[PDB]
Amino acid sequence: MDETGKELVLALYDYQEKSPREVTMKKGDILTLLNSTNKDWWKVEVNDRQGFVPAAYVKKLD
C-alpha cells in the first residue's frame, strides 16, 4: 500500500529554492516523490526540506 517509494526522481540539474514552496536540490541526487499530479512541478523531499521542483531539471526513474 502506498507504493510511492518505488518511483524516485533524479536531479539532472541543480536548483536553488527561489520561494518557500520550492526546495533546493543538488544535481545527481535521488529524491523521493510526494506528489506527481503536475507535469511542471513535482513535490519532493530533500533531506529534511520538502517542496516543489521544476520537472525541467529533474527526471523520473522508471
From Swiss-Prot:
It is found in: Cytoplasm, Cytoskeleton; Cytoplasm, Cell cortex. Transmembrane segments: none annotated. Residues 4-62 form the SH3 domain. Morphologically, spectrin-like proteins appear to be related to spectrin, showing a flexible rod-like structure. They can bind actin but seem to differ in their calmodulin-binding activity. In nonerythroid tissues, spectrins, in association with some other proteins, may play an important role in membrane organization. Belongs to the spectrin family. Like erythrocyte spectrin, the spectrin-like proteins are capable of forming dimers which can further associate to tetramers. Interacts with ACP1. This is Spectrin alpha chain, non-erythrocytic 1. The gene is SPTAN1. The chain holds residues 965 to 1025 of 2477 of the full protein.
